[PDB]
Amino acid sequence: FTIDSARGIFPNTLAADVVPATIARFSQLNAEDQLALIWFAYLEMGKTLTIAAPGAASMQLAENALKEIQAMGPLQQTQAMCDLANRADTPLCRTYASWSPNIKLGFWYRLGELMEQGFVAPIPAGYQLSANANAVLATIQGLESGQQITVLRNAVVDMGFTKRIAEPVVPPQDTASRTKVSIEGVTNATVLNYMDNLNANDFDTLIELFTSDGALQPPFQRPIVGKENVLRFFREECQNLKLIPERGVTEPAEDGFTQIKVTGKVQTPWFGGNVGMNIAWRFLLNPEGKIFFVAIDLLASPKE
Amino acid sequence: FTIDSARGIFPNTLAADVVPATIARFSQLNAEDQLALIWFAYLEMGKTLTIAAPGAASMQLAENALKEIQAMGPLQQTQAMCDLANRADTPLCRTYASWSPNIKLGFWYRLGELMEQGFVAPIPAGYQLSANANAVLATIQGLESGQQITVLRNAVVDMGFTGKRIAEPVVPPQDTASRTKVSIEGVTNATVLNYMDNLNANDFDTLIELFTSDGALQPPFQRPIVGKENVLRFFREECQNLKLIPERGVTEPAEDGFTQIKVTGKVQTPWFGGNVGMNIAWRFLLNPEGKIFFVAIDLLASPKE
Amino acid sequence: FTIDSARGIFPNTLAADVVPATIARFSQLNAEDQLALIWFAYLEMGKTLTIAAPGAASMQLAENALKEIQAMGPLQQTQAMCDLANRADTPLCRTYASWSPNIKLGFWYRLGELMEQGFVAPIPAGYQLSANANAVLATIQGLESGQQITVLRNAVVDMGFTGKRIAEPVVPPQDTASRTKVSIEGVTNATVLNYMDNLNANDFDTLIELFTSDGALQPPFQRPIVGKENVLRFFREECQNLKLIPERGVTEPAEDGFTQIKVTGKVQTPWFGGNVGMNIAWRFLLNPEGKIFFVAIDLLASPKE
Amino acid sequence: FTIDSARGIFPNTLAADVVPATIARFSQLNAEDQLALIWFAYLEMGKTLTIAAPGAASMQLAENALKEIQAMGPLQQTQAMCDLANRADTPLCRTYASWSPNIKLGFWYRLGELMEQGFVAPIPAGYQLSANANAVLATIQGLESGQQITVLRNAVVDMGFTGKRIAEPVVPPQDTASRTKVSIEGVTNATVLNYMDNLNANDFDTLIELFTSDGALQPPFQRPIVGKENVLRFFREECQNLKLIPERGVTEPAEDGFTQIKVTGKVQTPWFGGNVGMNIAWRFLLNPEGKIFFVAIDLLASPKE
Amino acid sequence: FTIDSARGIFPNTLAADVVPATIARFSQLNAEDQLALIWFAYLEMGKTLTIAAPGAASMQLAENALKEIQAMGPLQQTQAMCDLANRADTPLCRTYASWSPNIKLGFWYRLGELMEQGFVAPIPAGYQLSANANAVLATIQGLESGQQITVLRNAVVDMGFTGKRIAEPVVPPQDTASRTKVSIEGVTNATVLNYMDNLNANDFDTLIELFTSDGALQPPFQRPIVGKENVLRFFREECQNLKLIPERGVTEPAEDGFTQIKVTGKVQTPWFGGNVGMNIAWRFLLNPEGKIFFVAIDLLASPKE
Amino acid sequence: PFTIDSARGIFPNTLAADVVPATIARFSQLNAEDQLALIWFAYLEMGKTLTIAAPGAASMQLAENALKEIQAMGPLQQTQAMCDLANRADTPLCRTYASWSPNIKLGFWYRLGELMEQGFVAPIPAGYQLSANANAVLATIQGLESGQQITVLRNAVVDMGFTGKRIAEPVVPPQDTASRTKVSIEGVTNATVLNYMDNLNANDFDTLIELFTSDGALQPPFQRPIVGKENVLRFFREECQNLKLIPERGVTEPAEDGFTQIKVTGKVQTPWFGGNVGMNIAWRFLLNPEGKIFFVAIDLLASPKE
Numbered sequence A: 001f002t003i004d005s006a007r008g009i010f011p012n013t014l015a016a017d018v019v020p021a022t023i024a025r026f027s028q029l030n031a032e033d034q035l036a037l038i039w040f041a042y043l044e045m046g047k048t049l050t051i052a053a054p055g056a057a058s059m060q061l062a063e064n065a066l067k068e069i070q071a072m073g074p075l076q077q078t079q080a081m082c083d084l085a086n087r088a089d090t091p092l093c094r095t096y097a098s099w100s101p102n103i104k105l106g107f108w109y110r111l112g113e114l115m116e117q118g119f120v121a122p123i124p125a126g127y128q129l130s131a132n133a134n135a136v137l138a139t140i141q142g143l144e145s146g147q148q149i150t151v152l153r154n155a156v157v158d159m160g161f162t163k164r165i166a167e168p169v170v171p172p173q174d175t176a177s178r179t180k181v182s183i184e185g186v187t188n189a190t191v192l193n194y195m196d197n198l199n200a201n202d203f204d205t206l207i208e209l210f211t212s213d214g215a216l217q218p219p220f221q222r223p224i225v226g227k228e229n230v231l232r233f234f235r236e237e238c239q240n241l242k243l244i245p246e247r248g249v250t251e252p253a254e255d256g257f258t259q260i261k262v263t264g265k266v267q268t269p270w271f272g273g274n275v276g277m278n279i280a281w282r283f284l285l286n287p288e289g290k291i292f293f294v295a296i297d298l299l300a301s302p303k304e
Numbered sequence B, C, D, E: 001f002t003i004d005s006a007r008g009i010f011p012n013t014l015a016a017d018v019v020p021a022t023i024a025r026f027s028q029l030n031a032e033d034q035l036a037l038i039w040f041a042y043l044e045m046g047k048t049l050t051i052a053a054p055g056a057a058s059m060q061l062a063e064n065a066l067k068e069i070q071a072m073g074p075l076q077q078t079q080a081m082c083d084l085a086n087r088a089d090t091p092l093c094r095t096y097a098s099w100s101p102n103i104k105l106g107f108w109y110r111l112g113e114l115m116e117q118g119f120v121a122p123i124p125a126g127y128q129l130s131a132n133a134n135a136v137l138a139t140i141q142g143l144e145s146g147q148q149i150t151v152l153r154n155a156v157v158d159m160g161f162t163g164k165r166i167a168e169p170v171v172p173p174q175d176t177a178s179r180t181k182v183s184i185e186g187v188t189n190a191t192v193l194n195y196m197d198n199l200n201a202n203d204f205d206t207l208i209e210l211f212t213s214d215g216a217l218q219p220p221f222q223r224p225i226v227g228k229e230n231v232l233r234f235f236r237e238e239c240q241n242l243k244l245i246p247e248r249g250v251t252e253p254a255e256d257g258f259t260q261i262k263v264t265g266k267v268q269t270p271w272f273g274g275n276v277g278m279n280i281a282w283r284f285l286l287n288p289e290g291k292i293f294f295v296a297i298d299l300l301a302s303p304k305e
Numbered sequence F: 001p002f003t004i005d006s007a008r009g010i011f012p013n014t015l016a017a018d019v020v021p022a023t024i025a026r027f028s029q030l031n032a033e034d035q036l037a038l039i040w041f042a043y044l045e046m047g048k049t050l051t052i053a054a055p056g057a058a059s060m061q062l063a064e065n066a067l068k069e070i071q072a073m074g075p076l077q078q079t080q081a082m083c084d085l086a087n088r089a090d091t092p093l094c095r096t097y098a099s100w101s102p103n104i105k106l107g108f109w110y111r112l113g114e115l116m117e118q119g120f121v122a123p124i125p126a127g128y129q130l131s132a133n134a135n136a137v138l139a140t141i142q143g144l145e146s147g148q149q150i151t152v153l154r155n156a157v158v159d160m161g162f163t164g165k166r167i168a169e170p171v172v173p174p175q176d177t178a179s180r181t182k183v184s185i186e187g188v189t190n191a192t193v194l195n196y197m198d199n200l201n202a203n204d205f206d207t208l209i210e211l212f213t214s215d216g217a218l219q220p221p222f223q224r225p226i227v228g229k230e231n232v233l234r235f236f237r238e239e240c241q242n243l244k245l246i247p248e249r250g251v252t253e254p255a256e257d258g259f260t261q262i263k264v265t266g267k268v269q270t271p272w273f274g275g276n277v278g279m280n281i282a283w284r285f286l287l288n289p290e291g292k293i294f295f296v297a298i299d300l301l302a303s304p305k306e
Ligand SMILES: CC1=C(/C=C/C(C)=C/C=C/C(C)=C/C=C/C=C(C)/C=C/C=C(C)/C=C/C2=C(C)C(=O)CCC2(C)C)C(C)(C)C[C@H](O)C1
Pocket: A034, A035, A036, A038, A039, A042, A051, A105, A108, A109, A110, A111, A112, A113, A115, A149, A150, A152, A153, A156, A198, A217, A218, A219, A237, A238, A241, A243, A266, A268, A270, A277, A279, A296
């Protein structure tokens, strides 16, 4: 049994690979078209969904970068934003690249407000997207909201130029206030402990469920391998999620292993209750019940 | 009054029609998926519920069939099990079809031990169910244990093709002085009470006399079994060593001086004993002399029923 | 390769097995609840979808049965419809059972008109369904129209007992110069394209030559139909005037130099024409010379498949 | 003017971004599904299109790597090929990663021959792709052949593990007297015509002189390659034996006395010769002396671009 | 913002300007060649697409003109049709010029039937088109059908010379309960959806209220029609019994808090029904209160747009 | 008998360059700013190999007030003024533009082009990109022979403005008799045809018009026939000065009613480009029994092989 081989459990699960396909089409585009396109998507999405403000901590970490850009003349400001999209090698891009995903998003959240207010150079008035860019935005607006926000997030995290800065780790939720999840057909203690500890931000307890060499595969990314690496991923990116699993199925695997698939919804704190993402979890447990591998899949539709 | 019309007494009774619904989904599947799915369901269920071993008599009746399969090579052992699931017409299927449900079940119990042990071709390692099959197993594992075992039982009895009728020996009735008696809140009707008590006693010759000559018994999700001869045969082949635990009932008049009675409670099958209580309703239509014209037995949709 | 093993090609295809599961729930119900339920579904569906009238030939084949029922009193008329739903053994059921599906459907279409007009005993006024029957109708009305009409068709086809075999006359094939041809993204395979084109042309004699002698066709939720004669009989009795509108497909090698091809698209039945598009997958297993060893036709679970 | 800003000249040009989108869907897949999928695409494409054999030089550079895999047992051979697809870090993957695209492609061409013959572990018999994998192949088979081969090329080139750069020997330029010359409707620009003519002649040393020191070339779906040294290296490692067939173009002024030129036509890769015509656009940005500051090459979305 | 500046929203949209280009080529031809060319295209197109007969009203408004031509000798009949094509100034041309397009088209439809029957002077026997005319017809026959019928429509509408204004009677709006509603991927905008639904319903009075007072509608290849009065007149004279089938769209902000929306899909004219689907783009420029300041309708160059 | 419109069909095998009106129709669909950008682009690219002849003093003076009013406006309004001409909007500038002869309109735009180059009139925004349709239209124009290129640009320019007050340059006095060269045409000794060529090459319009029947017509390339001596003479005087007609070969055939039809092919040079653009032309004459021109069509030919 290998991690890479474990990637193939439950092969009928239809993942929303329109998300990675759409990101790839986006990445082909001219940098100004990327910027205009996100700007457009945001303004038109923002009419029905309201994004949550970035936390105080994240705002503080982005503040110097946000001030340096605002101080520059209007062309330099547009050049700085193109450099991020083109993944150019500048000091700003290196700083952007060391940020955690929440800070990159908080940074762009704030540039968007300043562009609305007119204090940072906005997208030229009446600008028109290229043929390819219009098709890419057309595709995004046809996606359900959960897939829409995942496309926008991933385009934003990909900017910059490849020390690592993240927000402070929130202390785990006090035990007496923890609700527990219930899953039709799934009484497996490891899976239930997986949801409950993640909903409580109790990463130290969560990581103990994994084998030493175990792996976690977030949506559309390569598996993250080893307790050290998976715990880091928890701490930098998985605070304040809300996991709402609904049903599951349990099957034996090779070597006395067990494979469990659960489907349900997740809410990210950036949108709270206004975007429910349809998610599947695919677990491969070893004979003592440790997680050897868990994949998280953004589902292609609710009919899955 | 007709048997088919009598099927409609107490129409608010909510039967667990999810059981026959799942069986219909199961039957669509590819034969190897059926076998894999039951094998999977068995292994995952078997961690918390322990199935009773088949009786010596039943084991004996299944032995010639079990040895021919074990003797064949692994390619043809799995072909033989697919022929059963596909309900193909082979000599093994013809003989399998003549068996009573308990013998069909014992046959498969024994293949399960040999597959675990590695002496009969097992489900290929790391086999993955098709989309429809995974959903079907997801549904099964979401059921109450009582509904799970009924889905599996009916899926198993359903295998084979389409003659001789082979069943275990009929056990002698329980001695009279050793019989306990049921008590039912709201129900003193002697016929209903004699029906429960004699079935808990395996006294099928006394039970059958409660029925009118043309009367019918409708087991869960099946067509009515009509006539004393057919209903007795069903008693003798499938209703031994049940435990009927009725709890409450209600009594109402029907047309023509008939009386209809509904009783709800639990039943224990000897395959699982006290570890699976099925929630059951019995629906009686009694004629004016108290004879059973019709009795339906329902697997209930939930404990709230 | 066996036909039964070929049933498992493209196991990811999610068929709409809610259709057979809903049929199984329907079949548990009291006969009068079946009749009421269909009657209700018909009235509510008929507000937005209009059923095509049965053909002259079919109307004539059912006419004798239709006049005998109308001549009976209102009690016996309702008895006659219950016998059909209960699958009772009567002359009417024996005659109904020998009819082709289109003739059964036309038979009921005409009973529905007479019930509207008040000339055949209707569903009692203000009749209320049983708990299980309400749940079944709720489920049906929640399905896409393609699945709704399939449930109703199969519930209707399953009535009667269990005799010749009566079907309408075979319509002659479409004139060659008038035939359009389908186009399928990713599929230039001559056998697949000739399969679609000849069925849209009702050219069954050409269609059947595409099959291996022992080949099989598996209609939605049915067992495979095996052998050229059996598959040809099926074409001639049930597959006239369909409209096949395939859209895209994928082509893969199979064992032993065989080829498996999956096609997805829509089909239109003449009973509803363009008002109901069913989402269909075809699964072909072609042998090395390109003949159809097996073709399964799947009603898809949703438009996302 | 920046190279990155120059990427946006002629924004109406619709590139075939289904190619990078399809590659991204491919990259999500399980390693065995990627391999099975390409193997499937190959067998089905190879019935109508024949790929050219790898050159002697390339075959020799791949020689020891192919023997090591062939010497291993069947499980380890399949592990070795998974390691390449999973982009695992093994010495073989490091070796594969140092090869030029033509050598990587020759490596896989030869594994395909051995798998057909049965001398390298093949895709398991009757293997079935996963849901996502079936959809990805369906998409590939619906593309124009020019897009198919580009998807396949790019998926294989991306295997391995992200040093020393091994490539085939550089073929000396075509003798001057046998060189044909292109003609382009509406385009007399000397630089553009010299770009086509010298690339068709494999005269990379002359070609590179058309570029400014800081100029860039952007191959289909890649980031620009910047600087004469980098662009020359790309010519020498990947652009031998192409056939460029430009047809029409348009010339417009740009900022600062620059000139922007778009040309459309076809290209043939030596792997397929005249059997795959790719529809290509070239987008030139020339400085005032006629040097190429930027040239993008686009795979067009269809023949009407 | 001006109407003329708004004409440039979504400049990447490639309209089928081969249509106005071939009409311009047609307009150069000798009058008899125009008539022969249409006569030829009509006969050759009419083998696979059949035109809808003009309505009772339309036939009635053109009747007096059609009866005068039939009364003249064959020489003068041909002179009269030449006068129409040459845009000569005669009383017949003045009356033809006052007709709405549907009346002009119905007029020629009927001349086409009389010419076949031999009652109106036809295209001379064995006539051969001029060099330019043959090229023009070749171009037309190479166009997709949506573009063919548009070329023919516009050639016909352009004949005559050069108050009053005659059109058919206005069809009353479709009653509210029978109206279907369109759905557009990515477009929930109330104004865009109200635009489609009211036009598919012929509810021009509700439709026109969607426009700003100074707003404009630009039909395919025409100058924008400006002001509610002019746009309403256009709706009433030319846009009855269309069928709008929008499929997908994209929404972007414009200057001044405006919004621009592009939608692509198909339309059906009642002249050809479902046998010709034209590929259409709609381009909306909406002001902050959601009103249509500008809407352009484009015939698309191909299905790839 | 014979009508002007029927006479349009003589020598129907003549293949005219109908790509020219086809491209003009494609041009006219475009956004107004695209039309202006496109011509500007075509102009700069053509201007590397062909140089336009300067407008005459008279024409410049007639366009002078119009050009001064535009230069005085701000850059936003200058561009508005030019869009109004392309959009054929109704402004005083458009009404004045429309009353001008073709040569004055062309001189108007020649001069705006110089001021745009210099930066004194609002130029095409830097790095502007044409729309998809406009790019295809420019590609087509650059694929045409130069004779067809300049005809497309001429006609797009003449079409601008807004639908009598008719302004033209002064009429040049006819060439002195002793200085007139005469043409020679292989296969054509017809006195009317030869006098037609010789008098047009001499700007002797009063003599030319006497060659026509009273009801005769002249049909310039891609336009409707101009009918009647007064109308045809007006056309000569406003648009046909300083041409050079170089006929080469012809063919002579009888027509109905004792008429004669003659087709001549050759080249013509306009004074805007002189000898740097030869247009390939056919003339199609329908002559009555006394030798008068009932109808003469002038065709821009599709290629040199026609
Ligand atoms: C970039 C840009 C602009 C700014 C755009 C902005 C502000 C975009 C912001 C978008 C955001 C906030 C999107 C948020 C997305 C969040 C997502 C998709 C979170 C998903 C998390 C998932 C699904 C979690 C799954 C997990 C589960 C359930 C587990 O069990 C294990 C952990 C794991 C994380 C995998 C503007 C300024 C608008 C224009 C400018 O030109 C360019």
